[PDB]
């Protein structure tokens, strides 16, 4: 019925889904891999969007971050990895995505998450934020914590894919 | 291939906030069931039949949404309905805690079910069934927070 209407997103059944999952991923952990695996099971396509210029200087440069994640996720066919240097809402719009994936780890973050989601609604009304809890196995890990344990020689093999674990050891002398 | 999601709740009664969540969900999943708890441990104002009837009407305009009562383990229902997604609205910080606990248990009981969370639109961010009833019980205006069919039914229940 294209001669009459192109179609709206709401009230008319299911629509193609394309999600972005933004972060610094410095470096990508098993917790990140789980979140995107879950997301990619339920949406048509997923972009892991890696932040080029985080406020805090990252251990891995953008090129490195994008390379490690590309490797770690290459077994997911509906996933692509990209760097971006923009508001997450701008990137979503440029990428014609309609879903924004957020990992929801802690209570401390809930308010902040809701508030970002309100801002993103304001910026891009057609973008829906979707919140996944991390698996219990990855509930206490973060890029930051893994780096700091690794720095002081703790075992973090259980928390990273092999490519990332190797790149991390190289960074730490 | 197909996605089919359950949005469970007590829906006593369904509000504009619940309606917003399920509209958003039905745009992203092929099918959505509104799963209404038959026997909530605290007796509801509306019985199950009333809850289902109000919700059916409220959501009639959404083609890929079905409203159902259930009285079993959510994992058993999801399995019975061949659902692979569970939707929850996430309004309060207090809910997040409890919901994260149930989600973990649900992962133990049914690994193949993914739990997904939506935040309420800003408009609906402070409403709940419980609040709206409390306000309406003392004649406060709650026309803004309910669909007509539900509003009338609530007025009838209070008179």
Curated annotation (Swiss-Prot), chain B:
ATP binds at residues 10-11, 18, 89-91, 99, 124-130. The record marks 18 as: Transition state stabilizer. Its main location: cytoplasm. SUPFAM superfamilies: Nucleotidylyl transferase (SSF52374). Substrate binds at residues 10, 42, 74, 88. GO terms for biological process: coenzyme A biosynthetic process. It is found in: Cytoplasm. Disulfide bonds: none annotated. One of its GO terms (cellular component) is cytoplasm. It catalyses: (R)-4'-phosphopantetheine + ATP + H(+) = 3'-dephospho-CoA + diphosphate. Keywords: ATP-binding, Coenzyme A biosynthesis, Cytoplasm, Magnesium, Nucleotide-binding, Nucleotidyltransferase, Transferase. Its EC number is 2.7.7.3. Pathway: Cofactor biosynthesis; coenzyme A biosynthesis; CoA from (R)-pantothenate: step 4/5. Its cofactor is Mg(2+). The keyword Cytoplasm applies. GO terms for molecular function: ATP binding; pantetheine-phosphate adenylyltransferase activity. It is an enzyme of class 2 (transferase). Belongs to the bacterial CoaD family. PANTHER family: PHOSPHOPANTETHEINE ADENYLYLTRANSFERASE. Homohexamer. Reversibly transfers an adenylyl group from ATP to 4'-phosphopantetheine, yielding dephospho-CoA (dPCoA) and pyrophosphate. This is Phosphopantetheine adenylyltransferase.
């Amino acid at each position: 019925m294209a001669s009459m209407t192109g179609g709206q997103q709401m009230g008319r059944g299911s629509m193609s889904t394309k999600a972005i999952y933004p972060g610094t991923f410095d470096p990508i952990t098993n917790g990140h891999i789980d979140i995107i695996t879950r997301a990619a099971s339920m949406f048509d396509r997923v972009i892991l969007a890696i932040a080029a210029s985080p406020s805090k200087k990252p251990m891995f440069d953008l090129e490195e971050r994008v390379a490690l994640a590309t490797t770690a996720l290459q077994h997911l066919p509906n996933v692509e990895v990209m760097g971006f240097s923009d508001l997450m809402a701008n990137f979503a719009r440029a990428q014609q995505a309609n879903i924004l994936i957020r990992g929801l780890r802690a209570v401390a973050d809930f308010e902040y998450e809701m508030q970002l989601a309100h801002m993103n609604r304001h910026l891009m009304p057609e973008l829906e934020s979707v919140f996944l809890m991390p698996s219990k196995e990855w509930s206490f890990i973060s890029s930051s914590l893994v780096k700091e344990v690794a720095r002081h020689a703790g075992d973090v093999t259980h928390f990273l894919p092999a490519n990332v674990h190797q790149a991390l050891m190289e960074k730490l002398k």
